[PDB]
Write a protein that binds this ligand. Structure first.
Ligand SMILES: NC(=O)c1ccc[n+]([C@@H]2O[C@H](COP(=O)([O-])OP(=O)(O)OC[C@H]3O[C@@H](n4cnc5c(N)ncnc54)[C@H](OP(=O)(O)O)[C@@H]3O)[C@@H](O)[C@H]2O)c1
Ligand SMILES: NC(=O)c1ccc[n+]([C@@H]2O[C@H](COP(=O)([O-])OP(=O)(O)OC[C@H]3O[C@@H](n4cnc5c(N)ncnc54)[C@H](OP(=O)(O)O)[C@@H]3O)[C@@H](O)[C@H]2O)c1
Lengths: 263, 263
């Protein structure tokens, strides 16, 4: 079984490297043929990862992992014509709820990525975690069985909706405040901010209820507790659009999204 | 004040949900340690601390014992330090006939509908948060106390109904798979299902002798639902069968093997 990983980024390289250690035919595809300096962890022996451009690949793949930014997806899709066949499993290694409908293939699955890493130039440094949460089906089980030996942790989900939406809420809270406030997590020291955070979470959590998921105020409590231990259109934009889809009243979400739209 | 003894699957689950509303709820075990709790599988992990008997210094108004039936006697001597004379003790166990072992005024058997498992120091809750208790002044007071938690307290007019119903449910499926040393997959044999019915009719005959309205329809529902603590479940029913001088051939045959295993 052949595997391709579109997107030579922090997530893409980390996945591509770990799969090449199990199934070496795993191909990392980018826009240009380049070489990426990769660290499995900080202070690890530097490794060169082969990145082959679209023009270099001549074969179709059974499993394609798209790990580009959510606003970069539309640029990747046209290349799926020659990169994929009819029954190719397409996995979106992206944040938020990706544009699943934009991809004209039968087997398209949204993945919840929990892989922390950064890219500076062509030097990718991985920090921790190798987890990918995907919807449980026959092909995602086959892909799970294939990456048995790799430390890539594939978590098959009965309903990936709950996994997707939970991370949506997590990013909704702390990342919106840190971005708009232009500070670290220490901005949560302000009592007014913490109130906003819960209200912001409750807004998104209210949208999650409308989508049919079992998220209550206790979900907010657990997420707020997580914050004590430390792509807008696809994240906040998605929660916002579904808030209008159900004609909901989410003022805190509306305000955050209004400023994030203004960059 | 509420204290839960036994940091297992049930004990931790009750502890977690009550601590959300009643922060001073104390989870008590043999020794101090940390339990890794999951509200549901694949949910974010949450730590919950446990105090040992040596660490607990005060008495509690309400105590919830959530240990195995065969582990109750080891808990009993500690109750003279963790409780006062007016303390309500709730026995969150399966089976029956163990309320007499607890030397206190307010002892109530709880029909526990809280599913989950404990692997090492990791508790994974599955579904439901229901406790069924006999209705009285103290339980009514306990129900309103935990009204803000999602612990479902169902106050029954006559708890003997729910206790024995759960007894029969345990009697039918456990006994066969336990004696046959196989999974639920053993129920595919026509002889086994017929036997499973006859075993239930035996237990139903014991329940009828105890003054319950159980009939051939009660068995039919359990057979439809179908589509160690043995001394407190099969052992209890067998004991009461002798008390009423009943002829329960299927119950005797099963229990004699289960009893022998334990020796
Ligand atoms: N810690 C994390 O980074 C983290 C954690 C959890 C989830 N995620 C999510 O996972 C996804 C991966 O993000 P990331 O951190 O890998 O971002 P990143 O490091 O910037 O990855 C983007 C990479 O894709 C390449 N690329 C861009 N457009 C392309 C195209 N049309 N065709 C082929 N390759 C293209 C870029 O190459 P150039 O360098 O030439 O632009 C860049 O190397 C993100 O959506 C993120 O939200 C990330
Ligand atoms: N799905 C379910 O779990 C489920 C569903 C319905 C009903 N029930 C009923 O609920 C009851 C609770 O079972 P469970 O699932 O919680 O089993 P469990 O997970 O094994 O709980 C037993 C816990 O009690 C602790 N313990 C044992 N002896 C003790 C002592 N002397 N002092 C203090 N703590 C002690 C044990 O800790 P260590 O082992 O670490 O010492 C263990 O963690 C059972 O009788 C069961 O029939 C269970």
């Amino acid at each position: 079984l052949s595997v391709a990983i579109i997107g030579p980024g922090a997530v893409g390289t980390t996945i591509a490297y770990e799969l090449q250690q199990s199934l070496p035919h795993t191909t990392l595809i980018g826009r240009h043929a380049k070489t990426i300096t990769y660290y499995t962890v900080p202070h690890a022996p530097a490794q060169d990862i082969v990145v082959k451009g679209y023009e270099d690949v001549t074969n179709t793949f059974d499993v394609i992992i798209i790990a580009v930014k959510t606003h970069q997806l539309d640029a990747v899709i046209p290349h799926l014509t020659y990169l994929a066949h009819e029954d190719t499993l397409i996995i979106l290694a992206q944040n938020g709820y990706g544009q699943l409908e934009h991809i004209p293939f039968k087997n398209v699955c949204q993945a919840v990525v929990y892989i922390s890493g950064q890219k500076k130039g062509d030097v990718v440094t991985h920090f921790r975690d190798y987890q990918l949460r995907i919807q449980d089906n026959a092909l995602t089980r086959q892909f799970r069985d294939l990456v048995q030996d790799s430390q890539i942790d594939i978590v098959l989900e009965a309903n990936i909706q709950q996994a997707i939406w939970y991370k949506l809420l997590v990013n909704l809270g702390i990342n919106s405040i840190t971005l708009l406030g232009r500070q670290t997590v220490a901005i949560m020291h302000n009592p007014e901010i913490r109130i906003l955070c819960r209200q912001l979470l409750l807004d998104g959590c209210r949208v999650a209820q409308a989508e049919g998921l079992n998220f209550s105020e206790q979900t907010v409590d657990t997420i707020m507790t997580i914050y004590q231990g430390y792509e807008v259109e696809a994240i906040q934009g998605f929660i916002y659009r579904r808030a209008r889809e159900h004609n909901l009243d989410t003022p805190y979400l509306d305000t955050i999204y209004s400023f994030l739209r203004a960059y």
